[PDB]
CSV table of C-alpha atoms in Angstrom, one decimal:
chain,number,residue,atom,x,y,z
U,1,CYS,CA,45.6,82.1,15.0
U,2,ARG,CA,44.3,85.3,17.1
U,3,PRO,CA,46.8,85.4,19.5
U,4,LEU,CA,45.8,84.3,23.5
U,5,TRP,CA,41.8,83.7,22.2
U,6,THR,CA,42.2,80.2,23.8
U,7,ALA,CA,41.7,78.8,20.7
U,8,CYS,CA,45.4,78.2,19.4
U,9,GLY,CA,46.2,77.9,22.4
């Protein structure tokens, strides 16, 4: 992940 990058969600 990598914060609220939108990916991790």
